[model samples]
Target: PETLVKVKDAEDQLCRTSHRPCRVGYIELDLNSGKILESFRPEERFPMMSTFKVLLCGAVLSRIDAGQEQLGRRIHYSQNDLVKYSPVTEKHLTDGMTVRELCSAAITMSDNTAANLLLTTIGGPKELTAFLHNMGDHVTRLDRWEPELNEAIPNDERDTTMPVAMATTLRKLLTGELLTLASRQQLIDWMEADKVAGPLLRSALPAGWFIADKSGAGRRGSRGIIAALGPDGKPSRIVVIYTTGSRKKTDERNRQIAEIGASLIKHWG
Candidate 1:
């Protein structure tokens, strides 16, 4: 497919960059035609790092919808959730907040305490894994919440799907074809609120381009890129999951990822 060619070209370019061993994964789908336009090893699983928060968000909402949990229910964060050098959760604030706010903090700021609180409140990671499995995301797993390891991600469950599966998930979410409309909207809103890093979804597009997705970086020298539905909401949904095994600074690595995304946009658009 034409889209696949363009994505492959971008992958090649990313791999050629120095100081990093890159494995670029992407999936571009025709939202209208339901065709897989481009993909690079979509089914292959790699550690998703904080990007797994998206799944946690989904599970929490599902519990709320099922009357198993209340969104406004308040939960307290203790010192056990704290980690050194962590900006958001390190303050050791002893404040009780609603579940909804916790989810917002977890996804929006990538807060480790909020995430751990959510993880524990929502029956921990086993429930999350079960939820994803029921939704057909067999490759998704949530093992633990180790802050040092980015919130207790087990070595086995810390994996990612190629661009194809990521894009497919995005397509399903946007069209209200996966789970419920309320659930889908919740996920999209959280993704749009992602602020720990922003360039991959927001970079190199026309001004006012509406992108709702999550960006993730791993301690293992890898980057995760995901995006979907720019403005018109036709078939423009694109997902790019690139992992680089490099020691580059976060900003520089993000620039490379953004450049690849920009080039792909030009080629596909």
Candidate 2:
């Protein structure tokens, strides 16, 4: 089909942009019919980086839904909770914040300290993995906090997930199947308000299109997953682009990511 051609062309163009080992995994499905329009390496898992925060958000919300945690509860951070590369928490060295505020900083600001705080509050990496298993997802794993992950040597122990699993989780969250409607909306709102990764996927989207996404970058490469809603204000597409082994040129990879988003919109919009 013409759509399939466009998808392949996009994938080829994206792959040609990088010389280092890289993978482009994507899946776009019709929100109304659950029909898949295009998919590439959907089952391939890659280093998740900050993209795992979305799952962390889900885990915390699950606890809240069960009345085991309260968003308004204040959590004080000690000197030990501090972590590098956290713009939000680095500014506030000694103050306490509510669970709601921390989650906002974690997702919207991509603050390392805030994410670790939430991970700790939700019972560490083991609990997060258990939460994913309970949701029937076996491919996603969260094994370390941000600081540990940042300091870790490249290996398989880091948190990771496949494009299909990430898309499926986001779909469930957006549809209110994984959490309460209110909680789902809150999670989406946080992602939409994200201050980072703005130029990667958002730059290529058509004007007035709504996008909720989380992007991650490290020494190796970048990863992103977005839930894009067309002009009608309904879910229209889900795109997951995960790249690794890029070495240094992150901006070039990001531009390619934008191009991929543009390609999807041009063909499927």
Which prediction has the highest lDDT against the true structure? 2
For model 2, residues 1-269, the per-residue Cα lDDT tens digits are 45445445544654565575555667776655556677877787677788888889889988898999888988888767788777887666667888888888988888989999999998898889899889878778888888565322344546777878877777776674779887888888888888887778788877778788888875455555556455545556666777655443666667767777777777764
> What's every prediction's RMSD, in angstroms?
3.5, 2.7
Candidate 1 C-alpha error for residue 67, in Å = 1.2
Highest TM-score, which number? 2
**TM per prediction:** 0.82, 0.89
- Candidate 1 lDDT over 1-269, as tens digits, reads 55456556655655555444455566666765658766776765556666767767777877877888887898767776665334555553666668888777777777767777888887787787777777776666666663544422222335445455556555665564555687777777877767766676467766656666676776645677666656554325556566655455677667766766676677755
Instruction: Record all residue pairs in model 1 with backbone atoms less than 3 Å apart, i.e. clashing.
Output: 26-163, 46-159, 46-160, 47-158, 47-159, 144-152, 145-151, 145-152, 146-151, 146-152
Angstrom error at residue 16, model 1: 6.1
TM-score of 1: 0.82
lDDT of every model, 2 decimals: 0.65, 0.74
